[PDB]
Design a protein around this ligand. Sequence first.
Ligand SMILES: CC(C)CN(C[C@@H](O)[C@H](Cc1ccccc1)NC(=O)O[C@H]1CO[C@H]2OCC[C@H]21)S(=O)(=O)c1ccc(N)cc1
Lengths: 99, 99
Amino acid sequence: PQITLWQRPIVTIKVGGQLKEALLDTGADDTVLEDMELPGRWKPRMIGGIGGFVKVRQYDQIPIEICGHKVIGTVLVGPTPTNIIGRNLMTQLGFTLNF
Amino acid sequence: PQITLWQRPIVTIKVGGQLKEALLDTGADDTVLEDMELPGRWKPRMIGGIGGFVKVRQYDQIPIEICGHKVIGTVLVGPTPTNIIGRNLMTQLGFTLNF
Ligand SMILES: CC(C)CN(C[C@@H](O)[C@H](Cc1ccccc1)NC(=O)O[C@H]1CO[C@H]2OCC[C@H]21)S(=O)(=O)c1ccc(N)cc1
């Protein structure tokens, strides 16, 4: 499908048995979700956003359902203005930018 | 053209007489560039993201060349860690996300 950008490109995700909304974010290398419970162990990760650097929780190999597709990969959990699906998972979906 | 997301989608822009590299950012509502001077009036603004908020100056109706194409719109200028082309300008090039 094709998604224009007059409004935020928000999609429904299913992660950790929870239905949420998230921003398709080509400016994000990594996927960052607001605080939630995920299984398994996490490791520390520091990410640099527009406001500076933040400690987040890195969970690896996490199943997420996005746009009718299952992806599996690294999900960072931490204080973010909004859930963001970064390039690590958008590539799993085969997203490209087109003009 | 079609731009991959395996790497950050960076493109060359021309703005304020100056050539720069910028991140195509579907996750960014507005275009924000690293501190520079732009002609005309501006209004102070705060934008929030991963690390918190940054204070920027908002210039309206600023001409920018992106991917060889001339567009106009709002440009926020401030202490962002990188130049970001937001949705407000990407729409004007008919940019879409496709999968
Ligand atoms: C958090 C989003 C809702 C908004 N951010 C846009 C987003 O694309 C930023 C854009 C961005 C890009 C680089 C540096 C700072 C901000 N990326 C980002 O925070 O990514 C972090 C998560 O993965 C990592 O990969 C890149 C940085 C890390 S934002 O930069 O804060 C932002 C907010 C408002 C406007 N107008 C413009 C930009």
